[PDB]
Every structure is written in C-alpha cells, then in structure tokens.
Amino acid sequence: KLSLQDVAELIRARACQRVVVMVGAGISTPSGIPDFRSDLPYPEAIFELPFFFHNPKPFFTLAKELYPGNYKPNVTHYFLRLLHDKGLLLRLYTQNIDGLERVSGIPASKLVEAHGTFASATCTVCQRPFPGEDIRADVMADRVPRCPVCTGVVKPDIVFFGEPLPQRFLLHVVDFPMADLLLILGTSLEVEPFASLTEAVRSSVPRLLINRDLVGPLAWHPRSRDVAQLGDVVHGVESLVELLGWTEEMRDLVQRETGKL
C-alpha cells in the first residue's frame, strides 16, 4: 500500500510533474452550488434537447443560477490552481458546469470542460455562436434568449444528454498514459467514458481518490498504487495539503484570490 503520506512525498519531491485530475460535483457543493436533481416530468429532462425545445425555461432557470460571477471557487478549486502554479498540472478534466475551475485561474489550455460551459452559447437553429455575455441580460431577466439571425432559441454550450462531448475531450487519449499521477476529487467516475479513463493510466501510476465514498472503477478494478481518502472532499484536500507542507501557501493563495473576487 501507499498512504496519502507517500503520495504527498512524491509530489513535494516534485517527482509528480504531470498530474491529471478528474473532478465532479463533490467539488461544486462547497461553493454553494445546488444539486441538479433539486415543472419537469423527471429531473433529467433539464438536460434533454427534445424537452428543451418544447420548454426551455427550466433550463434557463438553472443557467441564471450558475451564470458566471454568482458562485465563487472554494479551496478545493484553489488547491488545483496551486498544483498548476507549481507546474505540476498536466490537465484537469471536469464534469461540472459551474466554470469555477477557470475562475480559480486555471488557464483554459489546462482544462477540459467535458460537459461544456456558460462562457459561450449557440443558436439551436442556425448554429451561430455567441459569447455568453451576449445573452446575459436576457438570462438574468428571465427571458429566453433569441437569435438575432433567425429568432431561434440561443442555448448555452452545455452538453445535453445524447450530444457529443466536446472536441477537447479527446486529449484524454494521450493525457492519461502521460500522467505520472491521477487525482480524483469529488466524483465516482461511474459514468462512461470517465470510468474507462481511470483505466488508461499506466500500471505504476498512483491513483488518489478523495471523495465521500469509494465507488466506480477504482473499486471494481483496484490497483496496488491506488489510495482512497474517504470523507468530506474539502477536508480530505485540507489533509493532503498539510501532508504536502502547503497549508500556509494555500491560505495566502486563497487570500490573494479572495481579495480579487
């Protein structure tokens, strides 16, 4: 077995220079983001295109809530920022749609927003793209945004069920074998193709899971350099940060960034 402590020592020894990180809703929660299960026929219709076309207001209700500059990153986001600032982050894969990774200062070239973003939008009819700012007043005002070209509904570039994952997602193909550490925060990775992505790291590479529970591919197909640190995600991260000797660095980073937010 490796312990958390062992992983921590690899990182401080800057021996892990190519950390691939996978994240999900377990890191949104601490920023206040409501869980997406809580009028719709069943909650998943919120990300279903046929239903959206029939009635887009529910979705746009949620877009209003999550639109940029409402929510702020939490200290788990900032830990990932710190990894990046140290030159240790190969890529960060997010299933979340709150865009808090980019607000935390991680550059877009280091990020894969696997479920899309509110940063931009697309006309559902003529496919004209829009910067997200261009539909913000409508969204903020509870009016369904319409295309100036064709009058079609303008949809934020959130990936809906059945729609292709973004282009950038295919960086996984080589990011995962290229990693010298896999970090999994706040997600199980039970859903394909994320599940299969955990298997794509090389045999010798540690996989460190920080999450409420042990779930998905790390439980079904365990490896001997897996480490699972189970509990509140934030507190698991606070523990790794201490084992790294980065506690004061984290404080100072968060203060500097909070000063800016």
């Binding site: 299960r37 479920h115 990936v159």
Partner: peptide, 7 residues
C-alpha cells in the same frame, strides 16, 4: 454522445 444517467 454524453450518456443518459440519473441527475
């Protein structure tokens, strides 16, 4: 396609 799931 993004996979149908619950939530």
């Amino acid at each position: 396609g993004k996979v149908m799931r619950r939530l």
